[PDB]
Amino acid sequence: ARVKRAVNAHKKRRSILKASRGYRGQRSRLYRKAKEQQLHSLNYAYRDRRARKGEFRKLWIARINAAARLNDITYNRLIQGLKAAGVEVDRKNLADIAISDPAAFTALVDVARAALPEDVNA
Amino acid sequence: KLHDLRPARGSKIARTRVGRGDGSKGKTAGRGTKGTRARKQVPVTF
Amino acid sequence: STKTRGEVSGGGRKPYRQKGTGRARQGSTRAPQFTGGGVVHGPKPRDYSQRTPKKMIAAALRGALSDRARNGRIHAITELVEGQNPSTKSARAFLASLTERKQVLVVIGRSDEAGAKSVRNLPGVHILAPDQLNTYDVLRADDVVFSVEALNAYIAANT
Amino acid sequence: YAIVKTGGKQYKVAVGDVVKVEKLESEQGEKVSLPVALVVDGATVTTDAKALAKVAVTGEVLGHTKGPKIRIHKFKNKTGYHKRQGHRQQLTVLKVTG
Amino acid sequence: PTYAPKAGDTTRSWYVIDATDVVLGRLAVAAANLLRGKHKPTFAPNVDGGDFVIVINADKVAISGDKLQHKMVYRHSGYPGGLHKRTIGELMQRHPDRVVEKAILGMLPKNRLSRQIQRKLRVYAGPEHPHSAQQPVPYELKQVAQ
Amino acid sequence: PKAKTHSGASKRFRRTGTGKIVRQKANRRHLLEHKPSTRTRRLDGRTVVAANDTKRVTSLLN
Amino acid sequence: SQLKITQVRSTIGARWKQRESLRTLGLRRIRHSVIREDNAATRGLIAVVRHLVEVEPAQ
RNA sequence: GAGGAGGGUGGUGAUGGCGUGCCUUUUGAAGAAUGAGCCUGCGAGUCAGGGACAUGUCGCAAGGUUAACCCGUGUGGGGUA
RNA sequence: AUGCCGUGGUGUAAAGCGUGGCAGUGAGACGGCGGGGGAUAAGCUCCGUACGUCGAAAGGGAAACAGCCCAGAUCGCCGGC
RNA sequence: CGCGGCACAUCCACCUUGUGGUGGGUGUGGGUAGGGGAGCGUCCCUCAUUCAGCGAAGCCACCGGGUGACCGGUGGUGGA
Numbered sequence: 062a063r064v065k066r067a068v069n070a071h072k073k074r075r076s077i078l079k080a081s082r083g084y085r086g087q088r089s090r091l092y093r094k095a096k097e098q099q100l101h102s103l104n105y106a107y108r109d110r111r112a113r114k115g116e117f118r119k120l121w122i123a124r125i126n127a128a129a130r131l132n133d134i135t136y137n138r139l140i141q142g143l144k145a146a147g148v149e150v151d152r153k154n155l156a157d158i159a160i161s162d163p164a165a166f167t168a169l170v171d172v173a174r175a176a177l178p179e180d181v182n183a
Numbered sequence: 184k185l186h187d188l189r190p191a192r193g194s195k196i197a198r199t200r201v202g203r204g205d206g207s208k209g210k211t212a213g214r215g216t217k218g219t220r221a222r223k224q225v226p227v228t229f
Numbered sequence: 230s231t232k233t234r235g236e237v238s239g240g241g242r243k244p245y246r247q248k249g250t251g252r253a254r255q256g257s258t259r260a261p262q263f264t265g266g267g268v269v270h271g272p273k274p275r276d277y278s279q280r281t282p283k284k285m286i287a288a289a290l291r292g293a294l295s296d297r298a299r300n301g302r303i304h305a306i307t308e309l310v311e312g313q314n315p316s317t318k319s320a321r322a323f324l325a326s327l328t329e330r331k332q333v334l335v336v337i338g339r340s341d342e343a344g345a346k347s348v349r350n351l352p353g354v355h356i357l358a359p360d361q362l363n364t365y366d367v368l369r370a371d372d373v374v375f376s377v378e379a380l381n382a383y384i385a386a387n388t
Numbered sequence: 389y390a391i392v393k394t395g396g397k398q399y400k401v402a403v404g405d406v407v408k409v410e411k412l413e414s415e416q417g418e419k420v421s422l423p424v425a426l427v428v429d430g431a432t433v434t435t436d437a438k439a440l441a442k443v444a445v446t447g448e449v450l451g452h453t454k455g456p457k458i459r460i461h462k463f464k465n466k467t468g469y470h471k472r473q474g475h476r477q478q479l480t481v482l483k484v485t486g
Numbered sequence: 487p488t489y490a491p492k493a494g495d496t497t498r499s500w501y502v503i504d505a506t507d508v509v510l511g512r513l514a515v516a517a518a519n520l521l522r523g524k525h526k527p528t529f530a531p532n533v534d535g536g537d538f539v540i541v542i543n544a545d546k547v548a549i550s551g552d553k554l555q556h557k558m559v560y561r562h563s564g565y566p567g568g569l570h571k572r573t574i575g576e577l578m579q580r581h582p583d584r585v586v587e588k589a590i591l592g593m594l595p596k597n598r599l600s601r602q603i604q605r606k607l608r609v610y611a612g613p614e615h616p617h618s619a620q621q622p623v624p625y626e627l628k629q630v631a632q
Numbered sequence: 633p634k635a636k637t638h639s640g641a642s643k644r645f646r647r648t649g650t651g652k653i654v655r656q657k658a659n660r661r662h663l664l665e666h667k668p669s670t671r672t673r674r675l676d677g678r679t680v681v682a683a684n685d686t687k688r689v690t691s692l693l694n
Numbered sequence: 695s696q697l698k699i700t701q702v703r704s705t706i707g708a709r710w711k712q713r714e715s716l717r718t719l720g721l722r723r724i725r726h727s728v729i730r731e732d733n734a735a736t737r738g739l740i741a742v743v744r745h746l747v748e749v750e751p752a753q
Numbered sequence: 754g755a756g757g758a759g760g761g762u763g764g765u766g767a768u769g770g771c772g773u774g775c776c777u778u779u780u781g782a783a784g785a786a787u788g789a790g791c792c793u794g795c796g797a798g799u800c801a802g803g804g805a806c807a808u809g810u811c812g813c814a815a816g817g818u819u820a821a822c823c824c825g826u827g828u829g830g831g832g833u834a
Numbered sequence: 835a836u837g838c839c840g841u842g843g844u845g846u847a848a849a850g851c852g853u854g855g856c857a858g859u860g861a862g863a864c865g866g867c868g869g870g871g872g873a874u875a876a877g878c879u880c881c882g883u884a885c886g887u888c889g890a891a892a893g894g895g896a897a898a899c900a901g902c903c904c905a906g907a908u909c910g911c912c913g914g915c
Numbered sequence: 916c917g918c919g920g921c922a923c924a925u926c927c928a929c930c931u932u933g934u935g936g937u938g939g940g941u942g943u944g945g946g947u948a949g950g951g952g953a954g955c956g957u958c959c960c961u962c963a964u965u966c967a968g969c970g971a972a973g974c975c976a977c978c979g980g981g982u983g984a985c986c987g988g989u990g991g992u993g994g995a
């Protein structure tokens with residue numbers, strides 16, 4: 062019973078290549094070189110989605126800091142004040158507010174300033 | 184009939200094909216070494 | 230069958246020495262990996278038969294036939310002849326008028342006058358003597374037909 | 389508009405705002421209320437429990453569209469280790485009305 | 487998600503810093519963030535955002551003689567030797583604009599946008615700046631709170 | 633085609649009526665002047681195979 | 695009365711005795727507050743494990 | 754439905770972030786340790802034996818089982834050494 | 835001082851013992867702590883720890899970094915501490 | 916930690932209550948050598964059944980599906 066092992070292998074070849082399309086040079090043409098890249102690419106996606114989440118926090122923080130400085134207040138005391146106020150609002154939508162409605166951001170700043178106690182002593 | 188004829192459950196254990204990738208059993212497959220055992224069987228006596 | 234190293238003609242020469250050639254360590258011209266090479270772990274011409282207990286054989290057979298009796302698939306006919314000569318046409322009318330099924334097993338015995346001649350040329354119809362009543366034919370065929378002598382012989386041999 | 393708290397996440401939504409959310413016990417045509425985090429009508433800024441435990445975001449669940457198919461497999465190095473798998477997050481669609 | 491990234495959605499304003507008594511480092515930092523746009527909420531590191539920054543009176547930047555006579559500047563050419571060692575004091579007496587430029591560039595990232603940002607920098611040693619056709623905005627340094 | 637039994641094992645080990653194998657001790661065939669009767673009694677008799685090599689010995693006999 | 699034992703640091707460099715001590719305190723993850731009875735035998739386990747857990751009197 | 758705002762597929766991708774080929778052998782590798790130019794095809798743990806050990810299921814039940822061999826037509830019925 | 839054997843309670847999910855089946859390992863490294871060999875030496879070599887890590891563990895930090903610090907990735911999330 | 920989707924042990928109440936499964940809870944799930952368990956796929960014989968020159972196989976492109984090996988539909992080529 063000779064089986065002619067071409068077909069079964071071709072399923073892998075055409076699948077991996079059609080997914081690997083777009084890669085430069087001997088990456089989107091060669092099965093055995095493409096296969097390497099899918100391994101590296103997918104390990105990269107695996108860690109990059111998580112890093113992406115952290116990255117977006119970094120961006121949101123920077124923008125909040127910018128608007129906060131426009132209202133003459135730091136990010137530190139901003140978050141401290143909002144926590145004291147119980148305003149459990151995430152940094153994503155807070156940074157959104159910074160653009161959609163800067164006045165609302167100013168209002169939240171006044172709330173934080175009022176909620177903050179007096180100084181840096183305890 | 185034959186189309187309703189079935190083997191007993193628990194019998195007919197599939198043959199563990201050995202040298203067919205890492206997910207099946209392995210590249211070295213049992214003989215995970217480089218010494219005598221990797222290449223030939225030492226007499227049980229020795 | 231197949232062909233392993235040693236049956237392949239030649240191959241005793243060891244060309245492409247191990248220094249100054251830049252080629253792999255060939256060592257023989259008919260190794261498996263070479264075009265026209267031998268077959269490793271090939272299908273050697275096995276001659277085998279899964280010997281089983283006679284009690285398993287008999288139990289399985291009487292089990293299958295007993296299920297046919299439970300479903301009314303046993304047609305213990307008396308004979309099939311126009312006197313002495315065969316008549317396949319009449320066999321068709323008889324079998325397809327009482328059974329009305331595709332695959333049929335016929336048990337007659339050692340009578341070649343109108344035994345395995347009238348039932349021949351009937352797709353799905355197989356015929357055998359009581360002594361050779363296997364199970365594969367029984368499970369393949371539905372309306373198992375017996376002669377009176379088939380029942381007497383089978384029962385007598387099987388108490 | 390208002391920020392709705394649901395699925396462990398927060399989303400900015402307004403009236404008539406279609407947004408993808410996580411899987412929850414619902415069907416097709418049921419208005420399930422959801423808590424709020426912040427309501428901003430352009431001047432009013434809410435903050436505390438007097439608003440948070442007072443108002444909600446009522447919306448209909450109509451969609452049940454599956455997320456993108458993520459194919460993934462891990463690979464370490466010369467160790468000789470691969471882990472083939474995948475995941476397709478089951479989501480729902482929220483039509484925000486309040 | 488983000489709203490700021492978009493072709494043409496940038497306000498290219500002009501800022502002027504009277505760099506007389508200010509220290510080099512603090513000036514360079516404020517210029518760097520102000521130049522990149524981190525003082526704005528529409529930050530988008532992927533694009534060449536930010537405003538234009540003008541340095542005025544760079545000649546008068548206060549730097550101690552303890553560094554004028556010791557903080558050496560090195561421009562290696564590529565040839566054997568060719569380590570163009572020159573004092574920062576002499577650079578202050580020849581091309582102080584290049585000193586300030588160097589300090590800012592050392593605080594900017596090292597990437598393609600950094601060069602697109604560099605070409606948005608205009609530094610003149612003197613106080614009299616012909617560029618008055620645009621809208622200069624005097625900008626001073628400050629702390630915020632805390 | 634058919635198994636062989638190690639002749640030394642068949643000449644040194646004795647299977648009992650159950651799943652046990654015993655070993656004859658006889659470190660007493662060379663010099664017997666310095667050995668006390670205590671030691672020769674320790675060697676005298678027949679001792680069950682220690683469980684640390686029965687998985688080998690049973691295959692050596694069979 | 696009762697104590698709330700909350701693990702703060704992990705069990706990576708912790709040796710066998712410390713790891714088993716935490717197993718006997720019923721701790722499985724970092725923030726896993728466990729309510730323990732009177733100090734019949736907890737004093738030793740805590741004193742052995744002080745740098746990995748937080749001792750907080752609780753009801 | 755032209756052209757376009759907005760929305761969503763399929764390409765391309767400015768620009769930023771992150772990130773040291775695969776296999777083997779190694780205490781240890783991205784390799785300046787080795788091997789592969791690429792593609793297609795071929796190819797490496799299989800079988801006989803009334804073998805041995807252990808285990809799971811299936812026949813029987815202090816029993817079980819037939820080898821060689823005979824008859825016959827498929828491989829079934831007999832055969833007690 | 836620690837550590838070892840045994841004993842009475844408390845606590846704990848599987849950790850232990852015995853008997854069988856089937857293999858691997860049988861070249862280790864580093865760091866910390868005690869030593870010896872050496873030159874009061876070495877990224878040297880040889881010992882012990884129920885001391886750990888790597889080996890066989892990705893991630894964050896040490897600028898870069900298998901062995902140091904924190905911490906043991908089922909998958910997803912444009913959510914937090 | 917939170918919110919959803921898979922899985923492995925143990926446990927609670929059930930249906931054929933150790934054969935085999937249903938609802939729920941807790942804990943667990945990095946892993947080479949190596950053990951064990953459960954599967955996909957090409958070819959071939961047989962049985963039941965069946966599309967099939969009103970166009971199969973093979974091949975190509977697209978759109979979809981499955982936790983994965985992989986699978987389906989559409990269209991084109993081809994013609995058993």
